[PDB]
Scaffold this active site. Structure first.
Site, PDB file in Angstrom:
ATOM      1  N   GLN A 172      11.658  35.202  89.091  1.00 21.08           N
ATOM      2  CA  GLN A 172      11.791  36.101  89.270  1.00 21.08           C
ATOM      3  C   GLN A 172      12.189  35.920  87.188  1.00 21.08           C
ATOM      4  O   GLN A 172      11.864  36.539  86.054  1.00 21.08           O
ATOM      5  CB  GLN A 172      13.362  36.922  89.605  1.00 21.08           C
ATOM      6  CG  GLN A 172      14.251  38.226  88.206  1.00 21.08           C
ATOM      7  CD  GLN A 172      15.288  38.825  89.039  1.00 21.08           C
ATOM      8  OE1 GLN A 172      16.111  37.951  89.807  1.00 21.08           O
ATOM      9  NE2 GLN A 172      15.821  39.667  88.228  1.00 21.08           N
ATOM     10  N   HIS A 176       9.719  36.935  84.249  1.00 17.56           N
ATOM     11  CA  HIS A 176      10.215  37.639  83.153  1.00 17.56           C
ATOM     12  C   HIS A 176      10.800  37.439  81.487  1.00 17.56           C
ATOM     13  O   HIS A 176      11.180  37.620  81.058  1.00 17.56           O
ATOM     14  CB  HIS A 176      12.482  38.196  83.462  1.00 17.56           C
ATOM     15  CG  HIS A 176      11.414  39.231  84.973  1.00 17.56           C
ATOM     16  ND1 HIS A 176      11.455  39.069  85.909  1.00 17.56           N
ATOM     17  CD2 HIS A 176      13.084  40.092  84.556  1.00 17.56           C
ATOM     18  CE1 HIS A 176      11.285  40.191  86.711  1.00 17.56           C
ATOM     19  NE2 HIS A 176      13.135  41.179  86.241  1.00 17.56           N
ATOM     20  N   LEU A 353       1.875  44.017  91.051  1.00 15.24           N
ATOM     21  CA  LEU A 353       1.484  43.015  92.571  1.00 15.24           C
ATOM     22  C   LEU A 353       2.837  42.190  92.274  1.00 15.24           C
ATOM     23  O   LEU A 353       2.991  41.583  93.212  1.00 15.24           O
ATOM     24  CB  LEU A 353       0.550  42.529  91.874  1.00 15.24           C
ATOM     25  CG  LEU A 353      -0.003  41.418  91.006  1.00 15.24           C
ATOM     26  CD1 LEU A 353       0.661  40.475  91.531  1.00 15.24           C
ATOM     27  CD2 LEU A 353      -1.163  41.155  90.899  1.00 15.24           C
ATOM     28  N   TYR A 354       3.850  41.994  91.025  1.00 17.10           N
ATOM     29  CA  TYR A 354       4.600  41.214  91.147  1.00 17.10           C
ATOM     30  C   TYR A 354       5.869  41.279  91.149  1.00 17.10           C
ATOM     31  O   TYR A 354       7.045  40.946  91.558  1.00 17.10           O
ATOM     32  CB  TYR A 354       4.424  40.245  90.095  1.00 17.10           C
ATOM     33  CG  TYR A 354       4.112  39.021  90.015  1.00 17.10           C
ATOM     34  CD1 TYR A 354       3.241  37.894  89.476  1.00 17.10           C
ATOM     35  CD2 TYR A 354       4.972  37.676  90.335  1.00 17.10           C
ATOM     36  CE1 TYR A 354       3.294  36.505  89.744  1.00 17.10           C
ATOM     37  CE2 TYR A 354       5.388  36.810  90.522  1.00 17.10           C
ATOM     38  CZ  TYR A 354       4.018  35.753  90.520  1.00 17.10           C
ATOM     39  OH  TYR A 354       3.902  34.836  90.133  1.00 17.10           O
ATOM     40  N   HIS A 357      10.469  42.788  95.668  1.00 15.11           N
ATOM     41  CA  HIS A 357      11.834  42.974  95.922  1.00 15.11           C
ATOM     42  C   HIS A 357      11.915  43.074  97.286  1.00 15.11           C
ATOM     43  O   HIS A 357      13.157  42.143  97.570  1.00 15.11           O
ATOM     44  CB  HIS A 357      11.921  44.428  95.529  1.00 15.11           C
ATOM     45  CG  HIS A 357      12.289  44.375  93.403  1.00 15.11           C
ATOM     46  ND1 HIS A 357      10.980  44.523  93.071  1.00 15.11           N
ATOM     47  CD2 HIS A 357      13.499  44.011  92.700  1.00 15.11           C
ATOM     48  CE1 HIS A 357      11.241  45.127  91.726  1.00 15.11           C
ATOM     49  NE2 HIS A 357      12.564  43.524  91.372  1.00 15.11           N
ATOM     50  N   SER A 499      -2.942  34.498  87.705  1.00 12.31           N
ATOM     51  CA  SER A 499      -1.633  33.702  87.360  1.00 12.31           C
ATOM     52  C   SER A 499      -1.390  32.712  86.501  1.00 12.31           C
ATOM     53  O   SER A 499      -1.464  31.686  85.585  1.00 12.31           O
ATOM     54  CB  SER A 499      -1.264  33.277  88.764  1.00 12.31           C
ATOM     55  OG  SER A 499      -0.482  31.897  88.725  1.00 12.31           O
TER      56      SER A 499
HETATM   57  C1  HEM Z   1      17.896  39.827  91.783  1.00 11.48           C
HETATM   58  C2  HEM Z   1      18.372  41.104  92.024  1.00 11.48           C
HETATM   59  C3  HEM Z   1      16.599  42.097  91.447  1.00 11.48           C
HETATM   60  C4  HEM Z   1      16.643  43.309  91.008  1.00 11.48           C
HETATM   61  C5  HEM Z   1      18.790  44.044  91.589  1.00 11.48           C
HETATM   62  C6  HEM Z   1      16.025  44.083  90.720  1.00 11.48           C
HETATM   63  C7  HEM Z   1      16.069  45.015  90.084  1.00 11.48           C
HETATM   64  C8  HEM Z   1      14.760  45.700  88.931  1.00 11.48           C
HETATM   65  C9  HEM Z   1      14.643  46.661  88.044  1.00 11.48           C
HETATM   66  C10 HEM Z   1      15.733  47.733  87.418  1.00 11.48           C
HETATM   67  C11 HEM Z   1      13.368  46.135  87.453  1.00 11.48           C
HETATM   68  C12 HEM Z   1      13.524  47.198  86.384  1.00 11.48           C
HETATM   69  C13 HEM Z   1      14.663  46.498  84.797  1.00 11.48           C
HETATM   70  C14 HEM Z   1      14.100  45.564  84.495  1.00 11.48           C
HETATM   71  O1  HEM Z   1      13.384  45.346  83.758  1.00 11.48           O
HETATM   72  O2  HEM Z   1      14.708  44.427  84.641  1.00 11.48           O
HETATM   73  C15 HEM Z   1      13.612  45.425  87.709  1.00 11.48           C
HETATM   74  C16 HEM Z   1      11.883  45.162  87.917  1.00 11.48           C
HETATM   75  C17 HEM Z   1      10.992  43.970  88.234  1.00 11.48           C
HETATM   76  N1  HEM Z   1      10.926  43.419  88.905  1.00 11.48           N
HETATM   77 FE1  HEM Z   1      12.940  43.161  90.189  1.00 11.48          FE
HETATM   78  N2  HEM Z   1      15.423  43.500  90.230  1.00 11.48           N
HETATM   79  C18 HEM Z   1      15.652  41.730  91.567  1.00 11.48           C
HETATM   80  C19 HEM Z   1      14.852  40.391  91.312  1.00 11.48           C
HETATM   81  C20 HEM Z   1      13.743  40.602  91.406  1.00 11.48           C
HETATM   82  C21 HEM Z   1      13.441  39.222  92.133  1.00 11.48           C
HETATM   83  C22 HEM Z   1      12.891  38.236  92.751  1.00 11.48           C
HETATM   84  C23 HEM Z   1      11.510  39.834  91.238  1.00 11.48           C
HETATM   85  C24 HEM Z   1      10.722  38.889  92.125  1.00 11.48           C
HETATM   86  C25 HEM Z   1       9.487  38.468  90.700  1.00 11.48           C
HETATM   87  C26 HEM Z   1      11.013  41.243  90.804  1.00 11.48           C
HETATM   88  C27 HEM Z   1      10.356  41.410  90.274  1.00 11.48           C
HETATM   89  C28 HEM Z   1       9.928  41.380  89.080  1.00 11.48           C
HETATM   90  C29 HEM Z   1       8.957  42.448  88.299  1.00 11.48           C
HETATM   91  C30 HEM Z   1       7.774  41.385  88.260  1.00 11.48           C
HETATM   92  C31 HEM Z   1       9.844  43.396  87.765  1.00 11.48           C
HETATM   93  C32 HEM Z   1       9.208  44.599  85.892  1.00 11.48           C
HETATM   94  C33 HEM Z   1      10.057  43.617  85.429  1.00 11.48           C
HETATM   95  C34 HEM Z   1       9.626  45.062  83.665  1.00 11.48           C
HETATM   96  O3  HEM Z   1       8.546  45.040  83.858  1.00 11.48           O
HETATM   97  O4  HEM Z   1       9.912  44.239  82.823  1.00 11.48           O
HETATM   98  N3  HEM Z   1      12.912  41.151  90.759  1.00 11.48           N
HETATM   99  N4  HEM Z   1      13.315  44.754  88.998  1.00 11.48           N
HETATM  100  C1  LIG Z   2       1.230  36.061  92.476  1.00 14.64           C
HETATM  101  C2  LIG Z   2      -0.162  35.349  92.877  1.00 14.64           C
HETATM  102  C3  LIG Z   2      -0.729  34.988  94.037  1.00 14.64           C
HETATM  103  C4  LIG Z   2      -1.390  34.124  94.031  1.00 14.64           C
HETATM  104  C5  LIG Z   2      -1.328  32.465  93.638  1.00 14.64           C
HETATM  105  C6  LIG Z   2      -2.101  31.952  94.179  1.00 14.64           C
HETATM  106  C7  LIG Z   2      -2.433  30.849  93.189  1.00 14.64           C
HETATM  107  C8  LIG Z   2      -3.093  29.666  93.999  1.00 14.64           C
HETATM  108  C9  LIG Z   2      -3.918  29.006  93.882  1.00 14.64           C
HETATM  109  F1  LIG Z   2      -4.583  28.042  94.625  1.00 14.64           F
HETATM  110  F2  LIG Z   2      -5.310  29.611  93.111  1.00 14.64           F
HETATM  111  F3  LIG Z   2      -3.186  28.024  92.552  1.00 14.64           F
HETATM  112  N1  LIG Z   2      -3.063  29.773  95.577  1.00 14.64           N
HETATM  113  N2  LIG Z   2      -2.243  31.109  95.273  1.00 14.64           N
HETATM  114  C10 LIG Z   2      -1.762  31.349  96.541  1.00 14.64           C
HETATM  115  C11 LIG Z   2      -2.748  31.940  97.742  1.00 14.64           C
HETATM  116  C12 LIG Z   2      -2.438  31.684  99.350  1.00 14.64           C
HETATM  117  C13 LIG Z   2      -1.116  32.955  99.140  1.00 14.64           C
HETATM  118  S1  LIG Z   2      -1.154  33.703 100.325  1.00 14.64           S
HETATM  119  N3  LIG Z   2       0.175  31.621 101.373  1.00 14.64           N
HETATM  120  O1  LIG Z   2       0.024  34.623 100.549  1.00 14.64           O
HETATM  121  O2  LIG Z   2      -2.195  33.244 101.615  1.00 14.64           O
HETATM  122  C14 LIG Z   2      -0.523  32.823  98.290  1.00 14.64           C
HETATM  123  C15 LIG Z   2      -1.158  32.634  96.987  1.00 14.64           C
HETATM  124  C16 LIG Z   2      -0.360  32.869  92.085  1.00 14.64           C
HETATM  125  C17 LIG Z   2       0.244  33.991  92.188  1.00 14.64           C
END
Ligand code: HEM
Ligand SMILES: Cc1ccc(-c2cc(C(F)(F)F)nn2-c2ccc(S(N)(=O)=O)cc2)cc1
Ligand code: HEM
Ligand SMILES: *[C@@H]1O[C@H](CO)[C@@H](O[C@@H]2O[C@H](CO)[C@@H](O[C@@H]3O[C@H](CO)[C@@H](O)[C@H](O)[C@H]3NC(C)=O)[C@H](O)[C@H]2NC(C)=O)[C@H](O)[C@H]1NC(C)=O
Ligand SMILES: *[C@@H]1O[C@H](CO)[C@@H](O[C@@H]2O[C@H](CO)[C@@H](O[C@@H]3O[C@H](CO)[C@@H](O)[C@H](O)[C@H]3NC(C)=O)[C@H](O)[C@H]2NC(C)=O)[C@H](O)[C@H]1NC(C)=O
Ligand SMILES: Cc1ccc(-c2cc(C(F)(F)F)nn2-c2ccc(S(N)(=O)=O)cc2)cc1
Ligand SMILES: CCCCCCCCO[C@@H]1O[C@H](CO)[C@@H](O)[C@H](O)[C@H]1O
Ligand SMILES: *[C@@H]1O[C@H](CO)[C@@H](O)[C@H](O)[C@H]1NC(C)=O
Ligand SMILES: *[C@@H]1O[C@H](CO)[C@@H](O)[C@H](O)[C@H]1NC(C)=O
Ligand SMILES: *[C@@H]1O[C@H](CO)[C@@H](O)[C@H](O)[C@H]1NC(C)=O
Ligand SMILES: *[C@@H]1O[C@H](CO)[C@@H](O)[C@H](O)[C@H]1NC(C)=O
EC number: 1.14.99.1
Lengths: 552, 552
Positions: A172, A176, A353-354, A357, A499
């Site tokens: 996160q 972010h 894809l990322y 949650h 990535s």
């Molecule tokens: C920890 C508590 C979390 C809450 C309450 C939450 C909630 C939200 C909310 C409200 C958004 C859209 C608004 C923003 O930009 O923040 C969001 C987006 C997103 N979340 Fe989370 N989330 C959480 C954790 C996580 C985690 C662990 C990940 C793993 C990477 C994650 C990945 C993402 C991503 C990639 C977006 C899109 C952000 C953007 O486009 O700006 N979030 N989440």
């Molecule tokens: C969003 C995202 C997705 C995949 C990766 C990543 C990268 C690589 C590597 F080796 F090419 F560097 N593997 N690898 C990866 C490979 C297998 C799994 S699995 N255990 O879920 O099958 C999970 C991750 C990184 C970021």
């Protein structure tokens, strides 16, 4: 109306309209010819027979533990293998970038406008008869229905790879910096004009903010001491804008690179760790460079933390995600005699894809306590209460949720999962299978093949009717996971390429950058080349607590 | 103060201070080692003996007319040669870019801030004892003295290559899309955030301006008809900001991409030619694509004019400049199996070296008239008076001035030459010889070796004392020209690399772009691949007058 609404052209051929009712595919360099770029060239057929499936390759990377043990210890083999993992994927990403939410054909606007997320696959034209092109019904299924039926968590499903909260919050935090959707403009726009790992989430997007965040002695970031512990400065002291609900007292309004980080104590944890790390590197650099001024100490430190961040991501983070027995390596030199573009653009689909949650647990468990979502969010006391050490110990122990396999999005955050669905459609994403095809994967022929089970499949089938109309985002969270893995095939094969491009595309990996003096000498360079999630925490958290990315 | 002030490190080693009084050179990948990166590695010595001087290579490119005549007609040899001319130079440019006016060491600020011109050599540190580092006197010679003594034109010296005004104004017009110094910030900053050939000088830097310039039907640019001839619209009709002195009547205030183009009728000439060309390509594209809307027609046309521009510049413009008998080729495919960065950043030094004001004649001769500078500037009547055709005929006949060889800067424009000197110093340029060394050229050992004569040398010697303190810009205009050539060695060897990088670095040259559909089909592609300065004038200027970059 658009004769390209069907996505007629395969194997990366580009569809162009030649009259109101006809189309043509440009197959240049695809390896295929024919009206639809489906007839392979001779050389192409060899390759298509000597090419193992990704599921085979993954199998080889996650077995023969004994053989990998030997490879990992022969530096020249380890290098040969990493080089292959780096380069094999390159060809999957357009770079320079091509399309975006508004452009389904290359344009100078699409290339030059840095505010757009780029797009791995062009949007479905606005005047196509269906959302997915020509297939399906005039409208996609009720997003709420899909949410509730196959996305919402009944019981917490733990990640079989033992990912923990140190991992969840690291993803996160780290992601972010480059996922910063500019919601005033729309879901397909970004505020991360760096389009990569530039650590703007520590230092700020703009010089203006950076400067409020800085101490202007010894290249350090401002900070405050609370109960003998180092923490980010306050909004009152800095004037940097942060997002805090009005009821948050001025002394708890921490100022950091990223305006949203005050919202989750997990974020503020890493924000604090990296702030300490930067000032730490400053002391090291000053020691080596008593001649150096505040600017140079600051910039150099930043260059080093970018290196550390790339190192830790590849060798600890992706390492743990992958489950590979092969020890991944961060070594820019591996791309030096290779064709590669040191440049990146964040793809909307990478962002989508990322949205991991499902990682999130039902409660956040620190020491004795079990905090609900309601209690955890915007509550930095919790951090001051327990301190960094106790946060790290606790988060190292608490298991994170499985992302694929379905039914694991915490209810507390359902609105975010619905938006992921709705905003995908808003952005006119093509279908799951189009994306699979685009990443050299074999389309799914049924919903049951996607999920690997029957119940969720049946629900999905009742909702979408045709597998070829199934949507990327939900498919991601519902997909049959690799064996005991956190993700399914689609997530991996789309994710890995974006990535590694963002990691390796960074300019410090370029030949003219990747050398000791860039980082203030061999001592600076070594900080990068020895960095690890453990040292990061060890150097910066009291009692040098043990940590890792999985519940050991 | 700074140990690194003397520029101790050779062969592109990087100087880093290790304590107040010591320094260290990073020789990584330079091919040399030792305290100062001056001892060659074995493999490096071979190369240094099997490497012809640039003056040798130029000689071979400009003789054996008979042999080149054969090579030019064997497509695979022509391709092998152009590929070499393309790639041999690549290694001379840092890409990603590195330094700028404020940063003598790599920083994220230097890399990320798009408002800076980049720098091929780092500035001299602010606390070096002399302007050139450690050599010379506390101050450089009176810039006025240098101006007057070796730069100002006594008698008009014509270019022996027969360059004409069609050429002069093409270089001004073309270059002024990527040289747009932001004087509010300072000489080392740019308003050309495209950092290359993006034709913002036709279409505008910003979407806002572009949109005022556009008709929004058939992808065309607004225009007006005057006496049956097509011309750019007016400021009153468009609202686009232009720079005109207050006495210019609203109907003569032409609006074009580049705010400054109204200032010289030569510029407005090309601005009008390219406006016509864009609308011309629109008609062609509509004919091919009756399905297409205004946006796509506009964007595609723009992609095509970028291509035409790159084509003309390489095959006509640089061709003519080079004097080569080898026929240069614009063919992106030549870089496809090669290592190359599709990205560019405009270098301050490129800007400086391109101040070709000696090109300008004493008077501008159109039809019967001989216009003085005073009469020519900001006078667009002159254009409406004679028309494009007569402008093209006239400018094809009028010879342009020699740039090197000294004493050829028109007095009418002395202030601009002085500024070139002053602003170089303000930007802390290193010396001529540092820059020579940086581009693999042998330092000049005397002023007489620089000029190839005695008089100007003696004046320069009396002013600077030491050749190693001589400044780049004046040296450029004063240098001994190649035989019957327009430039001396330094101009060519610095200029060629920046030039080709900006031409070939453009994204449309990247594999995913360089294909028919990018440009709306084979008919659009063909416009690029057949474009020439002659076809441009002929499809767009009444009578299809004969034009060329040189005097007949
Ligand atoms: C920890 C508590 C979390 C809450 C309450 C939450 C909630 C939200 C909310 C409200 C958004 C859209 C608004 C923003 O930009 O923040 C969001 C987006 C997103 N979340 Fe989370 N989330 C959480 C954790 C996580 C985690 C662990 C990940 C793993 C990477 C994650 C990945 C993402 C991503 C990639 C977006 C899109 C952000 C953007 O486009 O700006 N979030 N989440
Ligand atoms: C969003 C995202 C997705 C995949 C990766 C990543 C990268 C690589 C590597 F080796 F090419 F560097 N593997 N690898 C990866 C490979 C297998 C799994 S699995 N255990 O879920 O099958 C999970 C991750 C990184 C970021
Ligand atoms: C036609 C009559 C010309 C006039 C009146 C003229 C005048 C000027 C002036 C006043 C400047 C500096 C002004 C400013 O940047 O604010 C300038 C800069 C410059 N001139 Fe010229 N010039 C002429 C022709 C040319 C030609 C033929 C060339 C050939 C390339 C040329 C090359 C340049 C360049 C490269 C700059 C730098 C501008 C920048 O940095 O953005 N000029 N000229
Ligand atoms: C990247 O692409 C973005 C989307 O096209 C651009 O953002 C849009 O730019 C326009 C202004 O440049 C705005 O359009 C409106 O146009 C009318 C016409 O007369 C004006 O009066 C309005 O003031 C102007 N804006 C408003 C408030 O109506 C768009 O609204 C604006 N935003 C979006 C999301 O479309 C970016 O400008 C572009 N980036 C760059 C660097 O060019
Ligand atoms: C690329 O580098 C440029 C040069 O450093 C940056 O330009 C400078 O940014 C500053 C704004 O952050 C301006 O500094 C002044 O700072 C004080 C702070 O207390 C303000 O009050 C001033 O108002 C502000 N400027 C003014 C209007 O007086 C600099 O003036 C400004 N320009 C220059 C030439 O330095 C660019 O910001 C930077 N680009 C990016 C994208 O970060
Ligand atoms: C500003 C600038 C300077 C040089 C060039 C350039 C590029 C090339 C090449 F090799 F790429 F084709 N030659 N070439 C060139 C070569 C020789 C001369 S000459 N007749 O003065 O010696 C003049 C130009 C282009 C732009
Ligand atoms: C054009 C024929 C004379 C050129 C050589 C003049 C040598 C420098 O003479 C200079 O001329 C400048 C321009 O007029 C004046 O502004 C200066 O007063 C003068 O010093
Ligand atoms: C491409 O497939 C064939 C041409 O071989 C053609 O009938 C078909 O219409 C094309 N694709 C689609 C979606 O119809
Ligand atoms: C924040 O955490 C504190 C300290 O643990 C707790 O007492 C308080 O109730 C929390 N506040 C909210 C709104 O959850
Ligand atoms: C580099 O050259 C030699 C070291 O081999 C030494 O004489 C010289 O002083 C060094 N640096 C400078 C200032 O020339
Ligand atoms: C501009 O040119 C016109 C006609 O070509 C000429 O008569 C006039 O004197 C010029 N005006 C200026 C301002 O020099």
């Amino acid at each position: 109306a658009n004769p390209c609404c069907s996505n007629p052209c395969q194997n990366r051929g580009e569809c162009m309209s030649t009259g109101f009712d006809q189309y043509k595919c440009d197959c240049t360099r695809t390896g295929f010819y024919g009206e639809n770029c489906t007839t392979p060239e001779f050389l192409t057929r060899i390759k298509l027979l000597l090419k193992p499936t990704p599921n085979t390759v993954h199998y080889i990377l996650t077995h023969f533990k004994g053989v990998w043990n030997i490879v990992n210890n022969i530096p020249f083999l380890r290098s040969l293998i990493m080089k292959y993992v780096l380069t094999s994927r390159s060809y999957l990403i357009d770079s320079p970038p091509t399309y975006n939410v508004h452009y389904g054909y290359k344009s100078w606007e699409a290339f030059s406008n840095l505010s757009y997320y780029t797009r791995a696959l062009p949007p479905v034209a606005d005047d196509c008869p269906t959302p997915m092109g020509v297939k399906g019904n005039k409208e996609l299924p009720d997003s709420k229905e899909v949410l509730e039926k196959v996305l919402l968590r009944r019981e917490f499903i733990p990640d079989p790879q033992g990912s923990n909260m140190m991992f969840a919050f690291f993803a996160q935090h780290f992601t972010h910096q480059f996922f910063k959707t500019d919601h005033k403009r729309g879901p397909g726009f970004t505020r991360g004009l760096g389009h990569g790992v530039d650590l703007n989430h520590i230092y700020g997007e703009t010089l203006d903010r950076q400067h409020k965040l800085r101490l202007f002695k010894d290249g350090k970031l401002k900070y405050q001491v609370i109960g003998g512990e180092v923490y980010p400065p306050t909004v009152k002291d800095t004037q940097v804008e942060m997002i805090y609900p009005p009821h948050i007292p001025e002394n708890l309004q921490f100022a950091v690179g990223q305006e949203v980080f005050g919202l989750v104590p997990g974020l503020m944890m890493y924000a604090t760790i990296w702030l300490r790390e930067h000032n730490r590197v400053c002391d090291i650099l000053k020691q080596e460079h008593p001649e150096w001024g505040d600017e140079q100490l600051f910039q150099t430190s930043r260059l080093i933390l970018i290196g550390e961040t790339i190192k830790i991501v590849i060798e600890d983070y992706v390492q743990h995600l992958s489950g590979y027995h092969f020890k991944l390596k961060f070594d820019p030199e591996l791309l030096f005699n290779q064709q590669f573009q040191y440049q990146n653009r964040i793809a909307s689909e990478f962002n989508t894809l990322y949205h991991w949650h499902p990682l999130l647990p039902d409660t956040f468990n620190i020491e004795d306590q079990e905090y609900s979502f309601k209690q955890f969010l915007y509550n930095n006391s919790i951090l001051l209460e327990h301190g960094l050490t106790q946060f790290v110990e606790s988060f190292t122990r608490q298991i994170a949720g499985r992302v694929a396999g379905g039914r694991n999005v915490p209810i507390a955050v359902q609105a975010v999962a619905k938006a992921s669905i709705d905003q995908s459609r808003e952005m006119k994403y093509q279908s799951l299978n189009e994306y699979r095809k685009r990443f050299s994967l074999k389309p799914y022929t049924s919903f049951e093949e996607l999920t690997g089970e029957k119940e969720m499949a049946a629900e999905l089938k009742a909702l979408y009717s045709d597998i070829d109309v199934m949507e990327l985002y939900p498919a991601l969270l519902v997909e049959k996971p690799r064996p005991d893995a956190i993700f399914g095939e689609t997530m991996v094969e789309l994710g890995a390429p974006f990535s590694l491009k963002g990691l390796m595309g960074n300019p410090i990996c370029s030949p003219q950058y990747w050398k000791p003096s860039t980082f203030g000498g061999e001592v600076g360079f070594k900080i990068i080349n020895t960095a690890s999630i453990q040292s990061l925490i060890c150097n910066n958290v009291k009692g040098c607590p043990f940590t890792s990315f999985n519940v050991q």
